[PDB]
Amino acid sequence: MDDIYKAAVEQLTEEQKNEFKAAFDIFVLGAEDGSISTKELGKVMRMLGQNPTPEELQEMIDEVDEDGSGTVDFDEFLVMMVRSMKDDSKGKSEEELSDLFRMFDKNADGYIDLDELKIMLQATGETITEDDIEELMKDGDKNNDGRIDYDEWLEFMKGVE
């Protein structure tokens, strides 16, 4: 029975909502609609000022909203436990694309280059080859041309891990 969250609730106490409500109220100090970052560990880990890594985690969670509501409710977080998303959640934002697009266009040509896009993974410690990225850009296309434009960068993250 139950879909996925209605099942755990059977063996889970709703009282927990108030348990993790403290750390939440302190995190949404500035958020009026409870808009905050889900990254709990990544926050305390990056707070130490260590190597880059969690910086990207803030992006995926930035637009974790899959239902497209605008914010995440306290309850929505609880149900996220039983399911255990483990990792990942999203990639880049709608309004952010307008910035990232030009942020990667270091060639000032209007399009995106391999050394430009791949340059990102170059500063993080990825676990892939340098030439491998060459295959990624190939998919970046969308308007049929062979390069990135003011539209492909958006559809780019159509669903890549």
UniProtKB/Swiss-Prot annotation:
GO MF assignments: actin filament binding; calcium ion binding; calcium-dependent protein binding; protein homodimerization activity; troponin I binding; troponin T binding
Species, as recorded: Homo sapiens (Human)
SUPFAM superfamilies linked to this entry: EF-hand
Associated pathology: Cardiomyopathy, dilated, 1Z: A disorder characterized by ventricular dilation and impaired systolic function, resulting in congestive heart failure and arrhythmia. Patients are at risk of premature death. Cardiomyopathy, familial hypertrophic, 13: A hereditary heart disorder characterized by ventricular hypertrophy, which is usually asymmetric and often involves the interventricular septum. The symptoms include dyspnea, syncope, collapse, palpitations, and chest pain. They can be readily provoked by exercise. The disorder has inter- and intrafamilial variability ranging from benign to malignant forms with high risk of cardiac failure and sudden cardiac death.
Function comment: Troponin is the central regulatory protein of striated muscle contraction. Tn consists of three components: Tn-I which is the inhibitor of actomyosin ATPase, Tn-T which contains the binding site for tropomyosin and Tn-C. The binding of calcium to Tn-C abolishes the inhibitory action of Tn on actin filaments.
Phenotypic consequence of residue 134 to D: In CMH13; no changes in calcium sensitivity of the myofilaments
Keyword check for Transmembrane: no
Residues the record lists as N-acetylmethionine modifications: 1
Signal peptide positions on this chain: none
A GO-annotated cellular component: cytosol
Protein name per the record: Troponin C, slow skeletal and cardiac muscles
Positions that bind Ca(2+) 3: 141, 143, 145, 147, 152
Record family assignment: Belongs to the troponin C family.
Residue numbers bearing the Phosphoserine modification: 98
A single BP term in Gene Ontology: response to metal ion
Annotated binding of Ca(2+) 1, by residue: 65, 67, 69, 71, 76
Domain EF-hand: 16-51, 52-87, 92-127, 128-161
PROSITE patterns: EF_HAND_1, EF_HAND_2
Keywords: Acetylation, Calcium, Cardiomyopathy, Disease variant, Metal-binding, Muscle protein, Phosphoprotein, Repeat
Residue positions binding Ca(2+) 2: 105, 107, 109, 111, 116
